[PDB]
Design a protein around this nucleic acid. Structure first.
Ligand SMILES: [Cl-]
Ligand SMILES: [Zn+2]
Ligand SMILES: [Zn+2]
Ligand SMILES: [Zn+2]
Length: 118
DNA sequence: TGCTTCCTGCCAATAACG
DNA sequence: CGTTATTGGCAGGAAGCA
């Protein structure tokens, strides 16, 4: 399945197939489905099947059209982090990863994902 | 070069378990 | 049914297009 590598005390886990390295063992198994496809994640809405659960989920939010990421500076909503960040940097000349709260992530409602409590 | 999708550390939500 | 193991949502940078 894998093999460990230990440098300076820090432990790294290596995919036996593609030799990628992971700090987390959880990340390894998650990544490993790409090779082995033991679990499949089919889109509820079409063709595609994905080797990670979160890839499917992002794809499904695309079909529904829900816009969960909102700019606090002007109200515009976007489908994902990428579009939001892009808008905010170019229109407001600010970075959202930076010191402050520049956007709101609304709960998912156009389908049923895990619901964080904050 | 500007979307589009992928990637992984982190950990909360959820599930399995004795 | 507390308690341990698993899942996958999230950020935000990397990578993959044409
Ligand atoms: Cl919406
Ligand atoms: Zn691999
Ligand atoms: Zn689909
Ligand atoms: Zn704005």
């Amino acid at each position: 399945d894998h093999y460990e590598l230990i440098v300076d005390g820090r432990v790294y886990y290596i995919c036996i197939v593609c030799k990628r390295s992971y700090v987390c063992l959880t990340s390894l198994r998650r990544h490993f489905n790409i090779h082995s496809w033991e679990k499949k994640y089919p889109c509820r809405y079409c063709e595609k099947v994905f080797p990670l659960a979160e890839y499917r989920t992002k794809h499904e939010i695309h079909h529904t059209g829900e816009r969960r990421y909102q700019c606090l500076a002007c109200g515009k909503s976007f489908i994902n982090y990428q579009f939001m960040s892009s808008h905010i940097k170019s229109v407001h000349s600010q970075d959202p990863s930076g010191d402050s709260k520049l956007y709101r992530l609304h709960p998912c409602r156009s389908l049923q994902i895990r619901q964080y409590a904050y």
